[PDB]
Amino acid sequence: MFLKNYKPKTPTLRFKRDIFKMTPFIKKNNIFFIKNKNKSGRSTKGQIIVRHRGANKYNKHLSINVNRNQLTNLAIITSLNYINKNSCFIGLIKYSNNCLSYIKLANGLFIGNYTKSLDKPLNFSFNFRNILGSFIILNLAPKHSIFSNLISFNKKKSNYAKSAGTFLSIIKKIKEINLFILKLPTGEKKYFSGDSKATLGRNSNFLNKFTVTGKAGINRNKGWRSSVRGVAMNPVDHPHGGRTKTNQPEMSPWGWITKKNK
RNA sequence: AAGAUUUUGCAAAAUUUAAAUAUGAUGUAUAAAAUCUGACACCUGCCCGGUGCUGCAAGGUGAAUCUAUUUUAGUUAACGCUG
Ligand SMILES: [Mg+2]
Ligand SMILES: [Mg+2]
Ligand SMILES: [Mg+2]
Ligand SMILES: [Mg+2]
Ligand SMILES: [Mg+2]
Ligand SMILES: [Mg+2]
Ligand SMILES: [Mg+2]
Ligand SMILES: [Mg+2]
Ligand SMILES: [Mg+2]
Ligand SMILES: [Mg+2]
Ligand SMILES: [Mg+2]
Ligand SMILES: [Mg+2]
Ligand SMILES: [Mg+2]
């Protein structure tokens, strides 16, 4: 879960920085794993609809309990695995009934740690006195806390903070009407209910922000192809195309203005 | 590769079609789309008059429809109908 500063034995390893993907601690399974068709920015009729997208050597799917309401036993963590699209880690979880699943892990966890889901107040977890990375109801939480994968009361799935190093800070708590006012990563505010649910602690890989690819072939092997300027392009192909590289206004090929107030 | 600006808070914006839909993505602002420059180091200065873009209280110009008011023509023996 740490950065690697490489010694400049090549041009591309001079600035590169990447995370230890922890292959020794990834016991791979065939229970949660599918590999679907790679969608290269196309529809079913073959036509490109979103550009700059292609082959992905790291295509997979791993089914996850974003919602951990269905069991309350205590658990451990046997192993780990990595996700690419959000650059987040996960970890298996073995419940005391020998059950199994994957979960979103929080920052500060690792093999050997414990985790559970909580129906009742905090004093009634005699196991698992530490509380990080646990599925909990927002009312049954401290004054100060931060949530990372939120499931609203009027909803099945989670729609906020699912990316790396994110959270949802609390601004207020209104237990009267059971209505919380949480902050998003941007800064906007949203009404949520304390009957809703979420995880505790920021999601894994806080340190993706301190990354440098250093090689074009690290994106090509994800499904990120080569972009092209609208200025090298011919006037047929793009509304900037031509010999002049200056342009009032600054536009998009389907026709609309990108830069506003500008 | 890297840097900056602009849009998008989730049945997301953008994209495809006449439409259902397809899709972005079973991804959630450390994400997605567009745009100009182009490793790294030092720097990236003054000006919002002009054009362009965005926004727009009050004010000015501003279409039909509804309503009210005013003015007026033709025709009929008459009431009246109509414009
Ligand atoms: Mg096309
Ligand atoms: Mg792109
Ligand atoms: Mg380019
Ligand atoms: Mg040319
Ligand atoms: Mg043409
Ligand atoms: Mg043209
Ligand atoms: Mg020239
Ligand atoms: Mg540079
Ligand atoms: Mg420019
Ligand atoms: Mg001005
Ligand atoms: Mg204007
Ligand atoms: Mg106006
Ligand atoms: Mg006005």
Ligand 4 center to A227 CA (angstroms): 15
Resolution (A): 3.7
Please indicate the experimental technique that yielded this structure.
Answer: cryo-EM
Both structure tokens of A145: 């806390």
Question: Which nucleotide's C1' atom has the smallest distance to the CA of A215?
Answer: B1
Residue pair A230/A241 in contact by the 8 Å Cβ criterion: yes
A 10 A CB-CB count for A205 gives: 21
Nucleotides of chain B within 7 Å of a protein C-beta? Answer: 1-2, 5-7, 9-11, 14-16, 22-40, 51-54
